[PDB]
Curated annotation (Swiss-Prot), chain A:
Disulfide bridge positions per record: C4-C15, C9-C24, C26-C35
Naturally occurring in which organism (per UniProt): Homo sapiens
All residue ranges annotated as the EGF-like domain in the record: 1-36
Phylogenetic lineage: Eukaryota, Metazoa, Chordata, Craniata, Vertebrata
Record PTM (3R)-3-hydroxyaspartate, positions in chain: D17
The protein, known as: Coagulation factor IXa light chain
Glycan attachment residues as annotated in the record: S6, S14
From Swiss-Prot, chain B:
Single GO cellular component term: endoplasmic reticulum lumen
Any one GO BP annotation for this protein: muscle tissue development
Source lineage: Eukaryota, Metazoa, Ecdysozoa, Arthropoda, Hexapoda
Effect of A151F: Decreased enzyme activity
Effect of D110A: Loss of enzyme activity
Record annotation: effect of changing R204L: Nearly complete loss of enzyme activity
One GO MF term attached to the UniProt entry: UDP-glucosyltransferase activity
Active site: D110
Residues involved in UDP-alpha-D-glucose binding: R188, G189, S190, R191, T192, R196, V235, S236, F237, A253, A254, S255, F256, R257
Function: Protein O-glucosyltransferase. Catalyzes the reaction that attaches glucose through an O-glycosidic linkage to a conserved serine residue found in the consensus sequence C-X-S-X-[PA]-C in epidermal growth factor-like repeats. Regulates Notch signaling by glucosylating Notch in the ER, glucosylation is required for the correct folding and cleavage of Notch.
Official protein name in the record: O-glucosyltransferase rumi
């Protein structure tokens, strides 16, 4: 997939494209699927 | 060579502007009619038969299910892009008090879901931000008008707050009038479509004509993603306004960049005519912007830039009209009233009684 191209991971997160979907890696301090929540 | 090109372009401009009519009779657009042609055309395929429960159940796999029931908003627990759901919910929540019941399958992915070449299981209705004639998806104003656009260093929470951005760009357009803008083409964005390549390559060969460089996005996999050059830094939307000639390209689908460029009072060069957002129909080529066909050549860029560099008052007129259109007809009020008008017309299509579903979560208000 190419879902990571639109930078869906907020707050300094990094993104990996899977086949169906994507996943965010979030830095210490943020959580949620898009790193959109405070930890 | 140069003369033939000039004649062709000036003919196209004269014709476009002679044929042009305003999107509403009055500029304030009290009845929210400016972009109404789009929502009518998007809902038209459902007019004769309406929307059945089966069509909704069948469409559910293509997006995030929202349900307005009893003036309360419900949703799938799992939103694929939570930050985009937040942007959408900003607009839905204020309307739920005065909206009848409905089920909405809202796709929050970049790419539309209902290919009109395929058929049957992909009959919809499904709502998506961007489409072409190849897709049956109903366009809605993107999340990013409030929240959840792409995240960058200058916008770590995602590009959003179009209300604030409008004021920021109005002020910056006032600070850098036409005559003080640099007479160069400008683009600073990532390689989300190879339609962007020839502009970047032209810039490398002729930096005095075009300043175009690839940034890196979160999907970066190899140096090929910047055509083997070091990744350039992000440039703010404000700083785009120092250039006279601003380029926009499709990305995965339509790009959120486009609307920002107009508010610089720069001349916008919009490449391709397929990928839409809901407001693109009333942006008219040669009236509000300079259209270029998909996959432009370096020679095409050289010709069109040379023409406008030599016809500077004409360039400023188009740029001014584009600015004015986005200023007057892409207000927050226009976004909010489009949402409302869309949903009110859609609900009339439903040929079934909306029932609660306990697995959905309560959103608000």
């Amino acid at each position: 997939g190419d879902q990571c191209e639109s930078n869906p991971c907020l707050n300094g997160g990094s993104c990996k494209d899977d086949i169906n979907s994507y996943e965010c890696w979030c830095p210490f301090g943020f959580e949620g699927k898009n790193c959109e929540l405070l930890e | 060579n140069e003369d033939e090109f000039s004649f062709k372009i000036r003919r196209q401009i004269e014709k476009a502007n002679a044929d042009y009519k305003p999107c509403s009779s009055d500029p304030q657009d009290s009845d929210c009619s400016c972009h109404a042609n789009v929502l009518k055309r998007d809902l038209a395929p459902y007019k004769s038969t309406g929307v059945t429960r089966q069509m909704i159940e069948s469409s559910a796999r293509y997006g995030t299910k929202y349900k307005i029931y009893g003036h309360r908003l419900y949703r799938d627990a799992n939103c694929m892009f939570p930050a985009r759901c937040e942007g959408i919910e900003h607009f839905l929540l204020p309307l739920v008090a005065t909206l009848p019941d409905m089920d909405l399958i809202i796709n929050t992915r970049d790419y539309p879901q209902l290919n009109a070449a395929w058929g049957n299981a992909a009959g919809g209705p499904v709502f998506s931000f961007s489409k072409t004639k190849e897709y049956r998806d109903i366009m809605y104003p993107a999340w990013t008008f409030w929240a959840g656009g792409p995240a960058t260093k200058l916008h770590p929470r995602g590009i959003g707050r179009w209300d604030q951005m409008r004021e920021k760009l109005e002020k910056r357009a006032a600070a850098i009038p036409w005559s003080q803008k640099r007479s160069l083409g400008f683009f600073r964005g990532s390689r989300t479509s190879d339609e962007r390549d020839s502009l970047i390559l032209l810039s490398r060969r002729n930096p005095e004509l075009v300043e175009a460089q690839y940034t890196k996005n979160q999907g970066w996999k190899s140096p090929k993603d910047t055509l083997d050059a070091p990744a350039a830094d992000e440039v703010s939307f404000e700083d785009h306004c120092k250039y006279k000639y601003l380029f926009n390209f499709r990305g995965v689908a339509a790009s959120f960049r486009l609307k920002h460029l107009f508010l610089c009072k720069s001349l916008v060069f919009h490449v391709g005519d397929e990928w839409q957002e809901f407001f693109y129909d009333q942006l008219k080529p040669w009236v509000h912007y300079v259209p270029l066909k998909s996959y432009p050549s370096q020679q095409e860029y050289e010709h069109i830039l040379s023409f406008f560099k030599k016809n500077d008052a004409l360039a400023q007129e188009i740029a001014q009209r584009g600015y004015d259109f986005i200023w007057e007809h892409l207000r927050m009020k226009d976004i909010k009233c489009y949402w409302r008008k869309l949903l009110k017309r859609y609900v009339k299509l439903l040929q079934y009684e909306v029932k609660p579903e306990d697995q959905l979560i309560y959103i608000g208000p």
